[PDB]
Design an enzyme around this catalytic site. Sequence first.
Site, short mmCIF file in Angstrom:
data_model
loop_
_atom_site.label_atom_id
_atom_site.label_comp_id
_atom_site.label_asym_id
_atom_site.label_seq_id
_atom_site.Cartn_x
_atom_site.Cartn_y
_atom_site.Cartn_z
N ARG D 61 17.69 6.52 -8.50
CA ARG D 61 16.78 4.95 -8.24
C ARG D 61 18.03 3.82 -8.09
O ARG D 61 17.82 3.29 -7.20
CB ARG D 61 16.12 4.77 -9.63
CG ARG D 61 15.46 3.49 -9.35
CD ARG D 61 14.33 3.08 -10.56
NE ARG D 61 15.01 2.50 -11.49
CZ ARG D 61 15.23 3.35 -12.73
NH1 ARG D 61 14.87 4.40 -12.99
NH2 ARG D 61 16.05 2.79 -14.11
N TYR D 114 4.85 -12.07 8.41
CA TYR D 114 4.09 -11.00 8.35
C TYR D 114 3.05 -11.17 7.19
O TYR D 114 3.45 -11.50 6.14
CB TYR D 114 4.96 -10.00 8.20
CG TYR D 114 4.41 -8.49 7.85
CD1 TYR D 114 3.47 -7.77 8.56
CD2 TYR D 114 4.66 -7.72 6.63
CE1 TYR D 114 3.10 -6.58 8.21
CE2 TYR D 114 4.22 -6.74 6.17
CZ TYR D 114 3.39 -6.04 7.03
OH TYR D 114 2.72 -4.83 6.80
N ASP D 186 14.46 -11.28 8.95
CA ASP D 186 13.60 -9.92 9.17
C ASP D 186 14.06 -9.36 10.58
O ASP D 186 13.10 -10.02 11.48
CB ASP D 186 12.27 -10.35 8.76
CG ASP D 186 11.29 -9.02 9.09
OD1 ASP D 186 10.18 -8.99 8.64
OD2 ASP D 186 11.82 -7.97 9.80
N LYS D 211 9.16 1.45 10.92
CA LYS D 211 8.77 1.20 12.59
C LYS D 211 9.49 1.64 13.32
O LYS D 211 9.94 3.16 13.56
CB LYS D 211 8.64 -0.35 12.87
CG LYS D 211 7.93 -1.15 11.52
CD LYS D 211 6.61 -1.53 11.72
CE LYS D 211 5.83 -1.67 10.45
NZ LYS D 211 5.43 -3.05 10.32
#
Lengths: 398, 398, 398, 398
Positions: D61, D114, D186, D211
Amino acid sequence: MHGSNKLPGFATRAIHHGYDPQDHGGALVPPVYQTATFTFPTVEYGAACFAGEQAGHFYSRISNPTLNLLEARMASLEGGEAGLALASGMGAITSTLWTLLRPGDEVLLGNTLYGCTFAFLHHGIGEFGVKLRHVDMADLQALEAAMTPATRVIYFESPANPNMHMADIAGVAKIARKHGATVVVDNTYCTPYLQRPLELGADLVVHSATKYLSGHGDITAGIVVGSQALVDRIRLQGLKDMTGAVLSPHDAALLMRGIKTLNLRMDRHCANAQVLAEFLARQPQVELIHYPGLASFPQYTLARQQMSQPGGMIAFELKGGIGAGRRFMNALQLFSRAVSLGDAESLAQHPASMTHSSYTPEERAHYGISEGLVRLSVGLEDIDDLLADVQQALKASA
Amino acid sequence: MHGSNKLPGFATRAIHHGYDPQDHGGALVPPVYQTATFTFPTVEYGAACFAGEQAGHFYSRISNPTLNLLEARMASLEGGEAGLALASGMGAITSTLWTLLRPGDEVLLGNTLYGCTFAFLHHGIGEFGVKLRHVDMADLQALEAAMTPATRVIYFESPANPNMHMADIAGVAKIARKHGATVVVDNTYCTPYLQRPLELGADLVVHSATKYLSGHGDITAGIVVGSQALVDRIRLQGLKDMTGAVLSPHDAALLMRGIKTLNLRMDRHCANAQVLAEFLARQPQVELIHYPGLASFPQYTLARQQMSQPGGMIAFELKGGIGAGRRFMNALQLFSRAVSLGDAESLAQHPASMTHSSYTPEERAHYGISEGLVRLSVGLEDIDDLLADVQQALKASA
Amino acid sequence: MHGSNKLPGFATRAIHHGYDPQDHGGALVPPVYQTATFTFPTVEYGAACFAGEQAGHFYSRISNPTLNLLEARMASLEGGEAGLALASGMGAITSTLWTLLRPGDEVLLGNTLYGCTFAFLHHGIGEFGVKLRHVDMADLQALEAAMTPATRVIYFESPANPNMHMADIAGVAKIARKHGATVVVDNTYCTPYLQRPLELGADLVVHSATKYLSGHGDITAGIVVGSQALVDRIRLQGLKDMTGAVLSPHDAALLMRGIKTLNLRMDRHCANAQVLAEFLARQPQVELIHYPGLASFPQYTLARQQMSQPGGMIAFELKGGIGAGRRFMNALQLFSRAVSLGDAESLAQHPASMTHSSYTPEERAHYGISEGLVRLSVGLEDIDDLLADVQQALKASA
Amino acid sequence: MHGSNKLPGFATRAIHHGYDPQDHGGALVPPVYQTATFTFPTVEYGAACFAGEQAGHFYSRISNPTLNLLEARMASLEGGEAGLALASGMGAITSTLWTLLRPGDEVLLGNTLYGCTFAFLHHGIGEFGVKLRHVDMADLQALEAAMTPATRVIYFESPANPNMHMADIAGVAKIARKHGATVVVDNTYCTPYLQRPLELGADLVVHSATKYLSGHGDITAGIVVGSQALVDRIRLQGLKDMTGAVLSPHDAALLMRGIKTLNLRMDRHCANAQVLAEFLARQPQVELIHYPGLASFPQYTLARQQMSQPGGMIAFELKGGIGAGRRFMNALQLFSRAVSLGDAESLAQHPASMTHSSYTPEERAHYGISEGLVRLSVGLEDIDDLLADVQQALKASA
């Protein structure tokens, strides 16, 4: 949601052919059927899709849904009726040959073959009653003469190592047609994108999807494409009984993914190969090159008749012998020293000092293994980095 | 990190054997080597890596690190010298036999074999010149009789279908030794946790890890364990050239994950099966019952001499014939109608109406497959739940 | 196949709950929907979906099928109406709290909390206007005393380190029930198998499935179970907009896989623990032992009414404090030195010399951690192997 | 070369940076570290690790070796100092924003964001005491007129839906180094191959690897790249504590696979969209087209400054409104009706009938959604096949 309609382009088929998300909950990418067996609603249904009187599944070694997509998609790329996915390139050929051949049959092979395909033939099936004959698949006269009523299968690779020698697939196909022999061609080097033997006449194509088809070197896989009758025979016998080369749905899903960029990647392998071959052609250390892109390539016209682009494979004879080859390979920094091809990363190899470093110049030469012949699989790296790498290796190979 | 073999307990070795995290960046779970190629630092390291001079890899079809761990571990569980990982049970079966047998040799088979194993034997190597003969491997008098100077290998499964018929492993091992034949046993049903053929005298053990070993039915894999000399040959010839049934590191790792609960899972299978067998026995619908855990089991004593536990497979025959079976199967809600075994999921099949449904009481009799024969692969579900399914399905069988 | 409805037994439901092969091409194990997006057949449908009018998917961050199953399953096992899978245990915790809390809200917390949950509250959501108050959930008079109108939720673990201190879930739920607070329990150590806080009164339960649920330590995942109403908010707010801790369906599958043997594994974790905890008890080098299984355990009665089994985790103190623990730890050979628990492998850890070596006797001490307290996560290895590792190590801790 | 040593080109680093097989057993494809916990050889070593004095791992993690290479690679591609992998794009922005903001802080946001990150900001951090204000990031004067001493972060997408509006990254960056504030861009749409905010002055870049980076829609991941300092902070605080959006090494290995063909796919995506944009510019049904490649595009010059290529997204409006938008949408045969982008598969969407189909024309406009705006994510299929699909759909819209 295309590929299967009237005639979508190659790149459109290598991405959509055979799958409509509307038939799988809408999942854009198809779900992975990583399962060994399937269940039936009734014992009656099981029986139906057991005797073939029904379309279904029951056990993955026989046929798997995600595997059926890769297969269907691959068949459409090679322009064949059907395809079969397997654990490896050797699983494809051995599975094909084990079911097509029987004791007393005769099989004619190209003067050169992929090491394990040679071993299998001369030390595997070859020792179980089957006949072997190595002929020049470019020599139609010799082919016709070497034909006997015992000839059941004609197997070769095009191009073939080490000099990328090409075969006359449409001519061989014709001869085998008159005599009734099945033509099997290994199309790993070109892929359905650069050459489609089935259209030139061959009956079945075998691939080592481990190479160009996966394109990233993270799976071992093989593929077969041909008529339904033939592929069905190979599926129900070669792979299931005589060979257990079952492909993991995961790897199949990995394969189907590397295929979604097959045209792009191939375009780039050739581009880097062309400029590298021509760059290699101006150095006095390189005394001979074996690349379909150069017009001096012996079988240039035949190559350009069957192949779409000269491929991303090249080999050359370093003037300087085995010593220069050793120096050339030891100096390489970007090009990795290893066996294989079709990877995004560039690979290179000197068989005389690697896979054959044990033999003698006398014996290695006997096997047509040149002393200073090194072979490279040109990857997707920046040519500049590539040209620079071999440029220094050459200065070191002296 | 304790798997000193033979010394550390089973469960201990099934989790740690062959792996020390300290040798891999402290990784508790070993890194999966999902690669196809391995590169060299020089061409001389590649040479020594090919002339058996140096330890290392170069191609995952020949040998892969993740598969090597899976292999070493399986070896330890079976008290064997070496192991081999393959694409499926048939990859191990065929890869083993393809290299041990040649044309002219004979092989003694156990009366009943796995469907595909029978097909490969009779329609595979068989049609290539190898002699086959079936002998009740429980009858040592007949085995000795059947022996010949040409018999090369004795191959059988124990227990076997359709009645869990056992063989005298040490019994045939003694005979095979005098004559000089190789005994290879298919230890799929038991797993190295319920039985270790190699310790009873066998020379090789083949496994369909697709079943109990993986235990979760998401992968197809096979395993071969035996002597280093035997396994090396099978690796370098059977797998490499004649089969190419290479196992994908992703699957080999899933298998090692399943094995980590082998003992736990096998204990529940045996616990659940016993209770179902007990129940099925006192049932008026049941004519015959084949479960090695019942004191009435023909070969009760022999079984307990070779098997540490009764396994979780059970077979029984319905008095009503195919009819009863069809109704019984179709009424099952928790049990699944399908083939295979060894999953946390309970599987049930009825040959006369499923696999061998295309038949007729003809060979269904010649093969010992009663019209009422039902095989159950008892899963790990709650026994209370499984009994209600069988009980309910039983009542519907009427 | 047996669903939930709470009728089928735990082992049945943890294997088949909410899944029918028939609905998925008859695939024994569910196909893994490793896809980021889902397409619509028409624009209308896509809309109806976005408006809840229709059930289907569109994006695997909000809802994925493979994860869905896992979620229907975990809810069943836990006895709640809905579940939700997240990238990790922390992703579950934070997502739940990030949506149930707002500035001015107050959170009543158990005394000791998992490291990262502590740091999250005091240095995370705590620095954003949320009031945190630690209380002894075992003391109902104290809790009800700390109860205020701004108390919005009550969070704790049971058992809780370093000495598995317990809580009165049912009693706490009562106080919270009358005030209107939301009770959320981190049921990571017990799992739905050994304890179901929801059935005791808790409103929501969280799990670090990176532990026992997976049981094989190859993935990190989180789970949340509770009402439809609460969980929906967490999914559509906590997961979707904040944290964005999305679980890979590959990992979700691996999790449903490890869960199939949940009961079997927990049964053994506990059997090994009991024996080990009883063997340490008779050791003169050990001063104190914390295991709900021992009769001397302080909350032994409360433990047995909330948990079906004492569990698989053990904490104890060596008489020689720091140095004894370091020497002990540094001598272990089968147990591993590492953080985490719930693996097939046995792990051990000594705060005073590992994670807390940083502090000082005083610091650590005044922080709850003794100087010789070591925690063991007993694995599935052979008990004699485990016992002999602690025995040898104890002697080396002299 | 073989990374970023001999100043290797992008394609060369995209597949070689940070990795040398000679360091990992010669494996060409780096081994996947699908493990949660890592063990230590001594408690001492573990202490070192936990503190940071010794290079190593102890829990995934926090940091995993397979993810470190993904991170280090991306760092090179974007020209940054360090990177970090997260369970998702949202996981990247929230993990980032959650650690750089506290009540009293103000963050300046681009005008359009977004869908989820907007909701996150306005219904997440925003409701937690953080002040957010939208300003056109193409208007440097307004941006500066908005700088307050409380401004700590400037967050914007560039291009930003629904009209691909750009922003002066070097500009806002200069205003930032002056008035403090950290710049977070971004960069999902362009990827480090088409645009590199870091090299323009940005402080951090967040990515929805889900993406283009992934490329094949089988993964959900996020990426953050920037300075060691800021990044180390987000790792140890946002990831570890407030988000837990851990990435599965499986997906991180997959994502590194797709990145291996970034340049190639990005080239096709752009070459494809141009043609499509040009074609859309000549149709009677189209009222307006927003493509940075059209010379008519408002920010044509600035786009040409920051983006090496026009990208693969195209939005346009139909004179016909919603009706025309639904019919054109429902009429698509190759393009798929779904949200999301950057996949080899071409996708299309019409907000007014899908996501906002419920709102009224007023509501829709009061958010920034046009009645006939459809967004197209042009895939890697065949351009002739794509033209035909849009062509007939456009006709269907009458």
